Amino acid sequence: IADSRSLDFAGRFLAATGGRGVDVVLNSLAGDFVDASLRLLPRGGHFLELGKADVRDPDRIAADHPGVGYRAFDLVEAGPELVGQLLGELMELFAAGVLSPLPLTVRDVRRAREAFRLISQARHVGKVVLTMPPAFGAYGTVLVTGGTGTLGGAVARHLVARHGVRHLVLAGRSGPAADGASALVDELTASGAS
Numbered sequence: 001i002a003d004s005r006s007l008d009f010a011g012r013f014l015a016a017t018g019g020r021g022v023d024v025v026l027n028s029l030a031g032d033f034v035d036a037s038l039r040l041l042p043r044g045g046h047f048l049e050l051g052k053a054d055v056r057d058p059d060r061i062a063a064d065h066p067g068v069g070y071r072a073f074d075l076v077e078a079g080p081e082l083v084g085q086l087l088g089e090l091m092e093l094f095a096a097g098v099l100s101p102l103p104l105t106v107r108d109v110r111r112a113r114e115a116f117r118l119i120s121q122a123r124h125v126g127k128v129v130l131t132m133p134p135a136f137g138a139y140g141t142v143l144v145t146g147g148t149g150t151l152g153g154a155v156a157r158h159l160v161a162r163h164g165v166r167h168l169v170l171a172g173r174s175g176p177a178a179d180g181a182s183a184l185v186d187e188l189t190a191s192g193a194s
């Protein structure tokens with residue numbers, strides 16, 4: 001480990017590798033950091049830049065730092081067919097217990113301003129995720145307890161009418177015995193919902 005806000009790392013790690021340096025260097029930092037990092041490829045290797053400030057020419061790097069293939073890249077350069085394979089390979093590993101989702105700072109999308117402030121102040125933890133408003137869907141089941149009531153049944157009619165609900169379970173102590181129950185079922189089932 002070493003501090004990211006100084007350049008001590010550059011001569012701290014070459015000293016820890018005994019001058020061999022490393023074999024690959026993934027950068028996000030700009031400015032003087034770019035050159036200070038190439039110093040950790042004395043024996044050459046890969047050096048690859050995510051940051052889009054201070055992009056460099058692969059050839060004047062290969063010259064000034066023999067055996068260093070430099071490529072600044074963006075995830076879009078992979079192409080959609082490759083992403084699928086890569087994502088397949090990753091999901092294989094998440095399911096094997098090798099990779100774990102990062103720490104999450106979660107917010108409701110309607111509260112997105114504050115979320116971007118967290119991010120722009122570097123005060124988020126790991127990954128920020130925004131979660132959409134509540135919604136009923138035609139996929140999956142919806143439970144309406146007391147769905148033989150003044151409105152509980154009226155809600156059921158309306159969920160299927162304008163919320164697209166296609167699967168319902170109405171519940172109550174009486175259950176089917178409730179009056180208007182088998183009548184409300186036939187009414188909703190005719191509306192296309194199980």
Ligand SMILES: NC(=O)c1ccc[n+]([C@@H]2O[C@H](COP(=O)([O-])OP(=O)(O)OC[C@H]3O[C@@H](n4cnc5c(N)ncnc54)[C@H](OP(=O)(O)O)[C@@H]3O)[C@@H](O)[C@H]2O)c1
Nearest residue numbers: 145146147148149150151152153171172173174175177178
């Ligand atoms: N309607 C209004 O103007 C109004 C106003 C304010 C608040 N609310 C609230 O809105 C909700 C619906 O009220 P509502 O006006 O439609 O009265 P409701 O017609 O009597 O419907 C209430 C439903 O809840 C069921 N129920 C009672 N106890 C239950 C239990 N332990 N477990 C499962 N189901 C139970 C009843 O079925 P079973 O007896 O067969 O179990 C009944 O079908 C209530 O929670 C009420 O507090 C309604």
